[PDB]
Paper text:
To find the acetyl-CoA binding site of EcMaeB, we collected cryo-EM data of EcMaeBholo in the presence of acetyl-CoA (EcMaeBacetyl-CoA) and determined its structure at 2.03 Å resolution. The cryo-EM map of the ME domain was ambiguous as is in the cryo-EM data of EcMaeBholo despite the higher resolution. As with EcMaeBholo, local refinement of the ME domain dimer sharpened the NADP+ and Mg ion maps. However, cryo-EM maps for secondary structures show that the ME domain of EcMaeB moves when acetyl-CoA binds to the PTA domain. The movement of the ME domain resulted in a slightly narrower space above the substrate binding site in EcMaeBacetyl-CoA.
While reducing NAD(P)+ to NAD(P)H, MEs catalyze the oxidative decarboxylation of the TCA cycle intermediate L-malate to produce the TCA carbon source pyruvate and a byproduct carbon dioxide (CO2) in the presence of divalent metal ions such as a magnesium (Mg2+) ion. The hybrid-type MEs consist of an N-terminal catalytic domain (ME domain) and a C-terminal activity regulating domain. The PTA domain does not possess an enzymatic activity of PTA but acts as an allosteric modulator of catalysis; that is, binding of some metabolites to the PTA domain increases or decreases the enzymatic activity.
Residue numbers in the entry:
A (entry chain A), B (entry chain B): 2 to 440
Write the structure that this text describes.
Amino acid sequence: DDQLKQSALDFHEFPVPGKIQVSPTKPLATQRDLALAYSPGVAAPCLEIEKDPLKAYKYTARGNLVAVISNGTAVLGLGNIGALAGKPVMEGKGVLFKKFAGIDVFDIEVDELDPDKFIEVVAALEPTFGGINLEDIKAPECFYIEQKLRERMNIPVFHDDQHGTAIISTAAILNGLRVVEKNISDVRMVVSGAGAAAIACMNLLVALGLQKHNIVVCDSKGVIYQGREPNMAETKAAYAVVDDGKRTLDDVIEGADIFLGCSGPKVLTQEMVKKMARAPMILALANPEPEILPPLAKEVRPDAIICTGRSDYPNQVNNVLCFPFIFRGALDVGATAINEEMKLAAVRAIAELAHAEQSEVVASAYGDQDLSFGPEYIIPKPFDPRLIVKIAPAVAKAAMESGVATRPIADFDVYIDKLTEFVYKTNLFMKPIFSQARK
Amino acid sequence: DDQLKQSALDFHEFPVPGKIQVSPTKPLATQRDLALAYSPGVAAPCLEIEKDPLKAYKYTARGNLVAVISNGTAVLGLGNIGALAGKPVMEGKGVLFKKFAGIDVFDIEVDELDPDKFIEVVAALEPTFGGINLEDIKAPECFYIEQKLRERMNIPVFHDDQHGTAIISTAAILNGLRVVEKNISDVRMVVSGAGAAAIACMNLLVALGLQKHNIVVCDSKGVIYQGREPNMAETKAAYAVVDDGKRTLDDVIEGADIFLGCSGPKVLTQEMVKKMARAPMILALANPEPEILPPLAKEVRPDAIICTGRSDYPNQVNNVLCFPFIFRGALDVGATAINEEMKLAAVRAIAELAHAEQSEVVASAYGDQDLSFGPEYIIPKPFDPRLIVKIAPAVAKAAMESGVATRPIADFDVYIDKLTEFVYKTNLFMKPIFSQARK
Ligand SMILES: NC(=O)c1ccc[n+]([C@@H]2O[C@H](COP(=O)([O-])OP(=O)(O)OC[C@H]3O[C@@H](n4cnc5c(N)ncnc54)[C@H](OP(=O)(O)O)[C@@H]3O)[C@@H](O)[C@H]2O)c1
Ligand SMILES: NC(=O)c1ccc[n+]([C@@H]2O[C@H](COP(=O)([O-])OP(=O)(O)OC[C@H]3O[C@@H](n4cnc5c(N)ncnc54)[C@H](OP(=O)(O)O)[C@@H]3O)[C@@H](O)[C@H]2O)c1
Ligand SMILES: [Mg+2]
Ligand SMILES: [Mg+2]
């Protein structure tokens, strides 16, 4: 801990303070160059945007600018630490946005703790940005804030901690259902924990075909049943079950095909997994420590499919899998929203990439490929270079079909060539070398 | 126009859209590199800032980050064009901030037209930035907005269109009084126009020693006198004079030592210059076309000292002379404000650089130096490389003495050497070559 802490503190304070810098995209050394980057020259772009608001994507950086906005109320796993203390996290997220999709990011830390005040603050910034990524806002205010901002603004508003993990988890459940040969309309699902990542996953899975009468939820109190507390929260009363004497996790797990966990460590035990239905699908996403260790489940039930959020186990749910590429697809077509069809276009592409993989140009002997679709490889690996070329055109085409695109793509072959060109300029070959050298 | 228009539109539409890009400052290609910039690594800086908010300058880019914020209500000379149409101007101002002082800038365009709502939007963004530059906001809302933000926020708030021109124009008058040998407390000033740049100039000049009873202001209606309109706006009533019959500019120009002009073209005539006192000091800053052409003034009064806002004449009052360097000085010492003592320190440094000049290392014959103090050289030239080495330490020292500095500078020789190092690594040698080539 101390070594990791010291290496992180020095990781960037010493060369210059902090990551991120703003750089001009032009050489500038003369007059007549400053006379049209400013001065009477800069009045020509302004008078064009005034006549046509759609011309702002030609003359400014708006078509490539995303805001990462937070108020510091749920920062990683630290909790409520304040907007100022969460600045490094937002800078890091902007770094990830740039590294894997080439998207410029402004990270904004708002001091408002009141939801309506926060909404008023964010809705006023629309002319600056081409899209908004809400990050690290505690539940249940996140649902209300995102819903209000989405119905108030004419640029995409995407809360990543809700919807990115939902997209990845839905892609994993569809692929796992193929392995175990079940149907989405018959499966019994048990959800542990209600919160930012859980409500959104249930919503997406219902949108793809899961029956709401096949879902039971449990939180820190136990089973969410109807009339348990006098005033149950919204989004918690939409999944409450009729009272039947069931109050703990052990009552509802018998016969469950799917376990979805986003709540605490050591929640699911070996006996409960034993009582589960044949070929169980288990998603233990609790971050410091999963609800069950994958070795402890594969022993009692070796036919189980397990999917955690850690890097030392297969099938890792890492949010870097979708957000840069969905935002790239939305930005490149001038979409005014990221709707459900665009969101479902991302689920299908991610699942397809893992069960229709066509490798090519492996990392020599330097690594470990085993990209065979099955219980151990159900979703793509977090830094797979083909994720930009699969997701972004699918999201762009979905945007063009739901009528939310303002700058439609004429030829998708040219677009795919450009994206492949971008991805060739970025390879991470030291990662396979380090991984192989670990053994 | 059409040639200039087409060249300016193409200036940045074609390589990529718009100026500005966001770049990481640390190399990112491996794991353990995207595990300190994010992942469990990024939690260590966050817990440091939670304990001590001052550590946000060590682990984060806040100590070098400035916001240029506008609502597009007074954009250059175009007027009320909207926040979105003014985005190129803000990007250009950020580029100038980066070129001459090495300061990262986020340009923010806010759609709010209501002053109190605008204030609520801006004050909430304080954790993001180390300082605020207000830009292109029409009067009289600008005074109210700036006063409220300054009393509300704990980082420097600085409206450039008021205070930068006030500082530069006060430096010119201070030097011109040296040339013409007059005392600040005994001169009569006539101000043509009352607005963002005029009220601020008068306030600063009065702060330096001008008697308020030696000032007469004259807006588009003529002389501003007591009881002229039923509800005379504030900032226009503190400079109203008693009613004496004086209504036009012709009745107040006789015997005036200083004429300050920030209102329209062809306001001052030759016969009105003929009536001024000995050695008239004239500042005609109306940007499209000045109040009087300097040749027309010099024809009748060869001893007159004329300043303009146009570069084709000597003594050009250009805002690039002030804002980057005062912001650099305030940022380097952790100033929580830019008060009056810091504003006047910048006035003296600018005046000293021109009346106590020691040239050295001219651009050989490639240029036109003639940097001798006198009527034709009263303030430094717009891109003089010694401006940051003179202004930033003066402002930092003033912040240290007025008590608003949170990170005092221990050694000023080290600071000056660092600023000199920055100056060396950015030289504009093509400008004097082109200027001499034109002659
Ligand atoms: N892709 C990923 O790896 C990924 C993505 C998102 C989240 N996660 C992880 O998932 C966890 C929760 O994230 P979140 O956004 O959902 O935050 P959250 O809603 O604030 O926390 C989970 C919620 O579930 C309930 N809960 C907590 N402990 C529980 C327990 N032992 N048994 C049952 N319910 C419990 C609590 O709700 P009540 O207090 O109302 O009962 C709690 O607020 C964290 O560990 C997070 O890191 C992982
Ligand atoms: N460093 C520089 O070169 C520099 C810096 C700042 C400004 N400027 C220039 O100065 C001018 C004014 O700037 P500002 O910010 O003060 O704008 P402003 O506040 O919008 O306009 C100046 C005010 O002067 C009055 N006025 C207008 N025409 C007049 C006339 N013909 N005779 C007398 N008064 C008149 C009007 O006040 P009423 O409507 O209340 O009568 C007007 O609102 C512009 O040309 C601007 O570009 C130059
Ligand atoms: Mg997050
Ligand atoms: Mg301006």
